[PDB]
C-alpha cells in the first residue's frame, strides 16, 4: 500500500494584486508539519496554487493524498480545465498561454507523483486544519520576504 497523507492548503492575499501568503499542513498518522511563506506582490489564486504545490513537493516518496482545500479556483482548474490544457499544449482555445500556467504546470507535475483524492471543503468553519492554514497564510502575507517572480503583472 501507499502511505496515506492528509494535506490541507490555503492562500491569502491583501489585494489584487498585493502582499500574500500560503499555508499548508501535512499529516501522517497523526503527526503534522506546516509550511508557509509570504510574497510582496501576488494574487489570492496564485497563493492557493502555491500552497498545494509546496505541500505536494515536500513528499519524499509516492503517497495516497487526501487533499483538502476551500479554493474554488483550484477546484475549477482541477475538475474543468487541466484535461483540456494537456490536450491543447497548455494554450487557451484562442491559442494563447493560460493564466498562471507556470504554477498549474508545476501543480500538474506534483500531482502525477501521487494518488490524490480531493476533498473540496465549503469553508474554514469546522475544519480546524483549514482554519489553521488560513492563519498561516495571513501571517505570511503580513511578513512577506519573497517576490512572486512568476506573477505577470496585469496592472
Amino acid at each position: 500500500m501507499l502511505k496515506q497523507v492528509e494535506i490541507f492548503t490555503d492562500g491569502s492575499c491583501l489585494g489584487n494584486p498585493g502582499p500574500g501568503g500560503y499555508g499548508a499542513i501535512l499529516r501522517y498518522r497523526g503527526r503534522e508539519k506546516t509550511f508557509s511563506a509570504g510574497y510582496t506582490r501576488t494574487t489570492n489564486n496564485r497563493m492557493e496554487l502555491m500552497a498545494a504545490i509546496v505541500a505536494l513537493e515536500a513528499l519524499k516518496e509516492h503517497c495516497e493524498v487526501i487533499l483538502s482545500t476551500d479554493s474554488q479556483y483550484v477546484r475549477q482548474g482541477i475538475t474543468q480545465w487541466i484535461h483540456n490544457w494537456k490536450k491543447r499544449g497548455w494554450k487557451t482555445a484562442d491559442k494563447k498561454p493560460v493564466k498562471n500556467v507556470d504554477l498549474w504546470q508545476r501543480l500538474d507535475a506534483a500531482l502525477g507523483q501521487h494518488q490524490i483524492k480531493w476533498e473540496w471543503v465549503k469553508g474554514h468553519a469546522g475544519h480546524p486544519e483549514n482554519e489553521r492554514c488560513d492563519e498561516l497564510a495571513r501571517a505570511a502575507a503580513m511578513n512577506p520576504t519573497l517576490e512572486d517572480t512568476g506573477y505577470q503583472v496585469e496592472v
Binding site: 497523507v5 508539519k33 515536500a58
Partner: peptide, 4 residues
C-alpha cells in the same frame, strides 16, 4: 518513516 514519515514521508515528509
Amino acid at each position: 518513516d514519515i514521508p515528509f
